[PDB]
Amino acid sequence: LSKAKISKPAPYWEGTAVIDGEFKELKLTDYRGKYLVFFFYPLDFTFVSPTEIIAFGDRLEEFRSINTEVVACSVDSQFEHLAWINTPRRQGGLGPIRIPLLSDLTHQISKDYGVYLEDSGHTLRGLFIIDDKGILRQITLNDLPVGRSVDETLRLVQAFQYTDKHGEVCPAGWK
């Protein structure tokens, strides 16, 4: 039932995101021309701590140096996303965040990406790296509240771009 495959176009999505405290409509093809790291961030009963979106948002400029945008997606509506954003993180909210929080209210994004568990309504923490032509280059799945790694995500993004520019060569760094 998952539509996410390596080297095929990443499954299309569109929905309402919270960007800078306001509602914007977002489409996967908006990010055409740049790399997109797209990861799922459950706010449900498994939630434990704001750490991961804070970590990715604070370093988002590093991603933009390499022509990469970051967006998180969750199965809650834009309104509860804004409620979470307006809840201070001392009280168990996210506080201000600098990456778009996308809404999957219909659940079909989480299923297209094979990250949705239909028993609990819970989303596994998938992270996906999509290149500037919309091809899916990376799938990372686990259920860890935290987490993924901003360092290894950017390292993966740079590895993909190096493969795209130099495809028939071995860099000296390989042994």
Partner 1 sequence: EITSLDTENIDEILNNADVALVNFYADWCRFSQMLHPIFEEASDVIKEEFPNENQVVFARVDCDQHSDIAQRYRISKYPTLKLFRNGMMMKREYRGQRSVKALADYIRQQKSDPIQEIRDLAEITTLDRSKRNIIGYFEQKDSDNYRVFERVANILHDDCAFLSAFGDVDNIIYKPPGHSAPDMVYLGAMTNFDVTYNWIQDKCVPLVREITFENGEELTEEGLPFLILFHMKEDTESLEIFQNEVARQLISEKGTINFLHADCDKFRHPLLHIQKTPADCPVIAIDSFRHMYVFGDFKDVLIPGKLKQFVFDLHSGKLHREF
Q: Tokens at residue 118, please?
A: 């239909």
| Smallest distance from partner 1 to CB 3, Å | 32
Report 11-50 residues binding partner 1 (CB under 8 A). 47-50
Question: Looking at this protein, which amino acid is placed at residue 137?
Answer: R
Number of residues forming the site for partner 1 (CB under 8 A): 22
| Smallest distance from partner 1 to CB 92, Å | 5
Strands 22-27 and 14-19: antiparallel
Picking from 54, 121, 124, the residue whose alpha carbon sits closest to that of residue 93 is 54
Instruction: State the binding partner of 81 from a second copy, partner 1, none, CB within 5 to 8 A by kind.
Output: none
Report 64-103 residues binding partner 1 (CB under 8 A). 64-65, 89-92
Site for a second copy, rule CB under 8 A: 6-7, 48-49, 51, 54-55, 58, 89, 124, 137-147, 149, 152, 155-156, 159-160, 163, 170, 174-175
The owner of tokens 């409620």 is 83
59 vs 65: CA distance, rounded Å: 10
| Smallest distance from a second copy to CB 168, Å | 10
Picking from 159, 154, 57, 44, the residue whose alpha carbon sits closest to that of residue 104 is 44
| Smallest distance from a second copy to CB 144, Å | 6
Question: Looking at this protein, which amino acid is placed at residue 5?
Answer: K
Q: Tokens at residue 96, please?
A: 């201000």
List 1, 6, 119, 172, residue binding partner 1 (CB under 8 A): 172
Encode 133-155: b = buried (16+ Cβ within 10 Å), e = exposed.
ebbbbbbbeeeeeebbebeebbe
Instruction: State the binding partner of 7 from partner 1, a second copy, none, CB within 5 to 8 A by kind.
Output: a second copy
Q: Between 60 and 105, name the residue whose CB sits nearer to partner 1.
A: 60
Q: Rule CB under 8 A: which residues touch partner 1?
A: 47-51, 61-62, 64-65, 89-92, 165-166, 168-172, 174-175
